[PDB]
């Protein structure tokens, strides 16, 4: 009863997921009942047809019921700070921020793909003594000593001293999972463990959702100027295997080709996972090496065509 | 729209086609719709609700019928040109509408 | 609606004299022949380098390479087993840079020909690449990378 | 574009490359450089030639498979080298745009396009009839030197014609 | 140079791995292959915009760069080394030339551009129209290296002039016709644009003719 | 005007009140402080309210009770002469013309169809106005 | 551009006219011999801007 | 008031007896006011024609044909519509 | 006059270099007055025929509609007054409304000149105001037909 009255959610595979599930089934009963009840009152003065019996009367014509009006003006109130109440102690669960993360994704979205750059592995079982790549940020300062001027403009750049075209923000690791066009990316974590992805987008505000996760986030193209939390942690993902993910926004004209992976296997696979592509190893290589499935298993890569009528 | 997303298959239409399909949808349903059609029924029946014999300003809520047919034809112009209409969605987020994104 | 299933700018081959052959696995990219002739033909017996990007489109690999030979007898020096999720490239197309002081298994895999088979700029001529996937015709071109005019002789007026 | 001297100098197939046109015209050994009272006279009557000039165009050997060809017209190209005349089969003004990746020869006079991958007929605009041809090949030297003449009246038609 | 591949190869991957795909090959319908393009392509296509390119139409309009002179370099220098193919030009210092490809004859430069360039874009350099959606730009934002750059790799429906087509000399005598009439202040007026009759009968009817019918409604009566 | 004043002085409570209360828990409890767009955005709509709030009130302390405001008025109390209220006019449309000619040249970055657009606005805007003042052709 | 004015002025001319009725009965020669000026005038500015070979 | 009134007698010369009335067109009298309905509905028929035939033209394009299709098609209608309802005295 | 030839610059043949066959802009239109004979030109349908071993090019049609043109146009009045019938001294002028048929069918001649003059601009029209060239041809084909009979129906109506 629960998956048909959750009204298509996914069961959660973090307990983030699974509580914010529940919040919603909880809104969904809320929501279920009020409106059970206010078509009850819909097609019952439905039933106040005018009646040939009667005469040339016509109603009470009351209008202006102060006690009623109060009473339904408190009780919804009531209804919502309920609601906001437990929406409140469940956002709580939205990033908690662990300053100890046990695996930490780049997820960099640039045009119509992603890349997931491992930035750092510390388990707290002990292992991984893994990094990411502090080189590879180059910036854009144009700090010429003089423009096409002759003197004194000595421009340092349009803003805070750097051009647009910066990609500063931007962080970059050795391990990077791209996706091509022709080879949707497969993130593969750690079951069991925190895993935290920093957010960035490398040209246009887009979405990183992962259906399963419950949860999407926007990534930004330069979210700490923007005044924007990108970083976002799940505490735990429980169940294994492939999860579908989507973008979630507007990306331009091939956002609904941004479709990745996330691929949950267990701590020792994520061993030799990553030991492998320390190696000189592709994704799906690693993938094959430990032993699954290298392509994204629950969505096939789009055809490039432009559509089924193009003649190829 | 609703055609193409009947089959899984991009059957006649492209992506960017159907971006500006929803772009011009949302906006035309909302902005040369909906918002110009409450003063359509205020045009229609608000002097005549107060008993008024017509409106504060009667040129300028002419101006302003035309203001609305013209402004809201020039926003469909987008199709004819080879390009089309504007790719992002009718919010028009700020990236993806400078002239780097969708130029 | 130009923007349509059928658009200009989506199905434009690259702006480069080699040709393109996506025929099997493994796609071949701006595969030309530098083959500078001083007269109207290549006279055979000359050798000529074959120019090409092998790049491989599949992670499941198709790096054999077996043959890729013609009529004019094609030997691939220094043949290396390269394409694996990337690119193989034979030779150095005019401009090309070495990106290091070093080099990988000495020359980087250079395919030239003996013609056996006088050859002309302007003309197509088949060029059969084989790899263990299976074997596709390419109709490689002649270009002249980035050699500058050749001094035509004064013309005499008569 | 040299001012006077030597304004037509002979060329060879190597000089354009994939998706390229080149304006020619119809030089002869006879017609030399532009240095003598003789010549700059021929030489100006060939740049003055209302019927002279034609376009060499470079199919991109990847679409050289999209090519179709005409009655009579089958061996005219020289491998990839394409030579059709500038003037526009319509009204006769050059035809001189050239749309590479899209092989079509638009003539700015009227907008009337001609697909140079098959023989350049007109796929739009006013124009009727398909450009023509020149035949084209290589002498000694491998310098290129029309192999015949166009087997049709090449200017914008009249009543006299198609017979 | 090493550490230019590699911003070149992390420009690209997070640019344009979706529509030119990883290895330089052209993703099937997307975009096309960049084996062979050179370093002139990557720079003037970049330069002017165009290639971060976020449409299929009939063509790629030009927009504000995505990048600055350096990571252009950087992306230029990838392409060149995996593909291999012509060079921007470049000065004695380093930097691209700008004032050297300003070549010094400027009649012949203007009998080429006629020749070959005014053929679409305009007698001046204005735009121009082409067959479905497409059109030739004004040339008169182009710098010396992008439209010498522009010739050497033809963009899009533009035809491709190597070298061997025009010697770097013709091309340079090409770049200064195409700035000098850019820049060049129009003598009797305001040129309306560049096209004579139509700017020119529009400015008739509009402000000629509204001054005489004006002026003959002041001195006239209404009846 | 004791209502139509009281309307836009409760707005502009609201509107005071949402505006500090927003800057407030922008400048803390925010990941980058005062939002500095949201903030200044509610405080100047606090502002339109406040203008037309106290232009509203002035003229209600300017002006006597009119019938319209007054409860028990007769229609007769009201019945008198109505002002000039325009009559057809034709000088609209060609207003939203040339105001429609001045933004497609500003979309298409058109300089010269926007010099003329604007001029188009000008003639127009000048018809309007004067519409109803062109004294009589003085031959 | 006094040619243009000229031309300009002659369809403005034939405008009113036309639209006046200042053609029937009467005046219906001095429309013809005014139609064949139009026509000269147009021509005339043909050979304006084409005596310049350019 | 500063306006004084206009007599006019323009000469006069079809009678105008038939065909429009002073009701339907309030200048009848005054200049040309009634152009026969067969004109009209023969002169949209062959501008539906002419639309389709431009079909027959040298270009490969297929939305072109599309359009002068519709737009004939409307022309049709409309002059269809228009001979149907002066059939039966405007009516429906 | 004098203001316009000092502050608007006019056919700068000095930037439109010499005539050359082989060398061509993309402008290529004529002055305004014969913009609707490029026009005609340009949007007429390509239509040619060719007889026993003859050929009648595209420019016959555009030849033939100018020479309707000018016919018409010179004959108007003798028109008028054949379908009319009125003969009849004519000293007063009528005003445009009070004609409403032949001030429909004078619109109706404007729409077609105005159309066939911006159609001869078409290539800038497409260049500048971004439409596609083919696309402005093809309007200017199909209101050649649509756009008079529109302008005719509004013009009879307004002056109505
Ligand atoms: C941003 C867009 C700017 C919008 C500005 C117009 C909006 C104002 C509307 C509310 C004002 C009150 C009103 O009802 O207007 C009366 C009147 C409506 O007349 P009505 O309905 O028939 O009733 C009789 C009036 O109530 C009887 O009153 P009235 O006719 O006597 O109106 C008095 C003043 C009415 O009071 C005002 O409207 C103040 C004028 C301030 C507008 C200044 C423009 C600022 C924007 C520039 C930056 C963008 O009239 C005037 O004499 C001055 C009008 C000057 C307008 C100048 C606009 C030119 C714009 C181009 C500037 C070029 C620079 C940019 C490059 O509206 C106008 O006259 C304005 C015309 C609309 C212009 C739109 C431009 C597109
Ligand atoms: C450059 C030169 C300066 C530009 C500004 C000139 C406009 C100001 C004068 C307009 C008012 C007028 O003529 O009547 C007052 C008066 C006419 O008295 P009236 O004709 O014996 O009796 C008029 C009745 O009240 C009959 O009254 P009504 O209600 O029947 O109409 C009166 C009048 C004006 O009524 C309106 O429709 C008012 C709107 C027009 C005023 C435009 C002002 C803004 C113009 C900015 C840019 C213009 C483009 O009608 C006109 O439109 C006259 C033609 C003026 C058109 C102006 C350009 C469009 O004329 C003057 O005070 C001097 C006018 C001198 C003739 C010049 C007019 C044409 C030159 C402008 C076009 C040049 C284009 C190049 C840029
Ligand atoms: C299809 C339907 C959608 C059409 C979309 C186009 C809308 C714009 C065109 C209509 C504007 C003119 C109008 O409504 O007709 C008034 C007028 C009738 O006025 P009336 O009140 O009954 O006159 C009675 C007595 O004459 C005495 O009455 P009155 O005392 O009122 O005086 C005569 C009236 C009559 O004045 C006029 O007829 C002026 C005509 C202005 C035409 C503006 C053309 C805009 C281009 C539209 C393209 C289509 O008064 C004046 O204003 C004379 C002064 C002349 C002012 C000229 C001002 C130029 C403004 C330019 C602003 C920039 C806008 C660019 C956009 O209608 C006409 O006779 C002209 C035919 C319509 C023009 C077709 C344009 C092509
Ligand atoms: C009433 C009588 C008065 C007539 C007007 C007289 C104005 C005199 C102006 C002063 C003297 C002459 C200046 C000549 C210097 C000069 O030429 O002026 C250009 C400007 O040009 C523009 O943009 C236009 C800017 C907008 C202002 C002018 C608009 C006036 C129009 C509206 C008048 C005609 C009426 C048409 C009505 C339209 C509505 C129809 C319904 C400025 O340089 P620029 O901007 O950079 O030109 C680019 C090269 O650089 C670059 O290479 C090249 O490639 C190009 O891009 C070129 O534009
Ligand atoms: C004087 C103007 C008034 C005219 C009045 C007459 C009104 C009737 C207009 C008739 C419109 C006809 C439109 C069709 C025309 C047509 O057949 O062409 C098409 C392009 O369709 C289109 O956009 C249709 C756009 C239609 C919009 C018409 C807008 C009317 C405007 C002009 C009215 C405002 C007038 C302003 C008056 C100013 C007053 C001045 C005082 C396809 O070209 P293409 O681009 O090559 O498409 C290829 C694919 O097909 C292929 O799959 C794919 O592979 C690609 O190759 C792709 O390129
Ligand atoms: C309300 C109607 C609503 C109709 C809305 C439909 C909108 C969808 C249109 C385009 C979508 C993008 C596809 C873009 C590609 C086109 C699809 C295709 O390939 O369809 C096959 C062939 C061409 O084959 P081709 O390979 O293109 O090559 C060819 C030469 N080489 O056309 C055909 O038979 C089938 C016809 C295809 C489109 C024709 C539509 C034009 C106008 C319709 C009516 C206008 C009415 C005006 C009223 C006054
Ligand atoms: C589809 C979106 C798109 C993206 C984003 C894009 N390209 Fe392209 N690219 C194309 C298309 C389409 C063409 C051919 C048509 C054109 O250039 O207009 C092309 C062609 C090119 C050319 C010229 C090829 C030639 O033969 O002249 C170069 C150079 C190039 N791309 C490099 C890049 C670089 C570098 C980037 C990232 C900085 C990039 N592109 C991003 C689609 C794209
Ligand atoms: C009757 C109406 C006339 C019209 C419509 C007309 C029109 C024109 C036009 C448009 C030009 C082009 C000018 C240019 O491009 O700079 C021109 C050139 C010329 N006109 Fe006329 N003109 C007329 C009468 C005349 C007359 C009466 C003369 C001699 C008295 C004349 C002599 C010339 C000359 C010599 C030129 C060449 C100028 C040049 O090449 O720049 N025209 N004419
Ligand atoms: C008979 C005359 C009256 C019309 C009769 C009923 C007219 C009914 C017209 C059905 C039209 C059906 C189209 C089917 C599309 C097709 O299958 O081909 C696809 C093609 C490839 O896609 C395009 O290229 C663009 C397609 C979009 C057209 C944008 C037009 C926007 C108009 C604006 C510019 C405003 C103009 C002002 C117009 C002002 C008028 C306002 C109503
Ligand atoms: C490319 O040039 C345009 C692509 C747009 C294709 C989809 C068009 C949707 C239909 C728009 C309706 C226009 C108004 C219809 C008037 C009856
Ligand atoms: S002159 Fe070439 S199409 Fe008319
Ligand atoms: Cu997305
Ligand atoms: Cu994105």
Redesign the interface.
Known sequence: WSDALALGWPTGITPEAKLNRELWIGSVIASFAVGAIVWGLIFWTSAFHRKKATDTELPRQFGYNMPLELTLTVIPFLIISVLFYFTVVVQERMMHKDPNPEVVIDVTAFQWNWKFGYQKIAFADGSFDYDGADPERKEAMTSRPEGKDEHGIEKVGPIRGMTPEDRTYLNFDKIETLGTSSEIPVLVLPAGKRIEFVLNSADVIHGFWVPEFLFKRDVLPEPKANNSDNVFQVSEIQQTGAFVGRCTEMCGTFHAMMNFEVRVVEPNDFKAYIDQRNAGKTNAEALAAINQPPLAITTEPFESRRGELVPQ | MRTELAMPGLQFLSNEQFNQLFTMHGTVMLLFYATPIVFGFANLVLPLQIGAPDVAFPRLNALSFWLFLFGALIAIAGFITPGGAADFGWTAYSPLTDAIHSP | ????????????????????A?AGQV?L??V?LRAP?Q???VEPGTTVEL?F?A???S??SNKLKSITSDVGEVTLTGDSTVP????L?VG??????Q??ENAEAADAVTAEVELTKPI?????YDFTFTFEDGETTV????????????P?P????? | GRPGESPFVKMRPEDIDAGGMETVFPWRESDGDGTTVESEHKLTEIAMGVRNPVMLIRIKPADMHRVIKRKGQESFNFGELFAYTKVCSHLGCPSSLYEQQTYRILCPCHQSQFDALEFAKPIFGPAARALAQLPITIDEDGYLVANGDFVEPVGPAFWERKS | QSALLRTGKQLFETSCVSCHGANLQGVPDRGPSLIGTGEAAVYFQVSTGRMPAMRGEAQAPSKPPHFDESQIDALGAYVQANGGGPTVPRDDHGAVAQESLIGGDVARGGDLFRLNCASCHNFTGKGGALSSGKYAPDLGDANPAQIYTAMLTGPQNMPKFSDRQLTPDEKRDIVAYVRESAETPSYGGYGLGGFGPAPEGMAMWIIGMVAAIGVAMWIGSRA | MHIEARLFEILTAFFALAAVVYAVLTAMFATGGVEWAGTTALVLTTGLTLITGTFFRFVARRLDTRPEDYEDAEISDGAGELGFFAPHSWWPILISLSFSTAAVGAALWLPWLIAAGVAFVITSVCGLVFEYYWGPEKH | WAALMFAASIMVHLARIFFTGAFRRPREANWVIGSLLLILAMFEGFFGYSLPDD | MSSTQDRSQLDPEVERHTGVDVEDVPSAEWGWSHMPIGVMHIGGLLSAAFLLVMMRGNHVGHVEDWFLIGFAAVIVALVGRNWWLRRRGWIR | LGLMGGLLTINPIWNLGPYKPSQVSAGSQPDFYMMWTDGLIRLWPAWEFYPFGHTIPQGVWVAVGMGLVFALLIAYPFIEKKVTGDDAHHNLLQRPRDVPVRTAIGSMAIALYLLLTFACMNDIIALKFHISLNATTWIGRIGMVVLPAIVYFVAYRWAI
């Open positions: 609606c130009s923007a349509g299933q059928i658009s200009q700018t989506t199905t434009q081959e690259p702006a480069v004299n080699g040709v393109n996506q796609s990219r701006n030309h002739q007269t109207d033909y120019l990007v790049a491989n489109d992670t499941e694996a999720d990337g690119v490239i150095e197309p005019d401009g090309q840079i990106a290091v002309t700029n302007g003309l197509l109709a490689v071109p002649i270009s002249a990378g980035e050699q500058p005019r050749r035509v004064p013309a005499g007026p008569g």
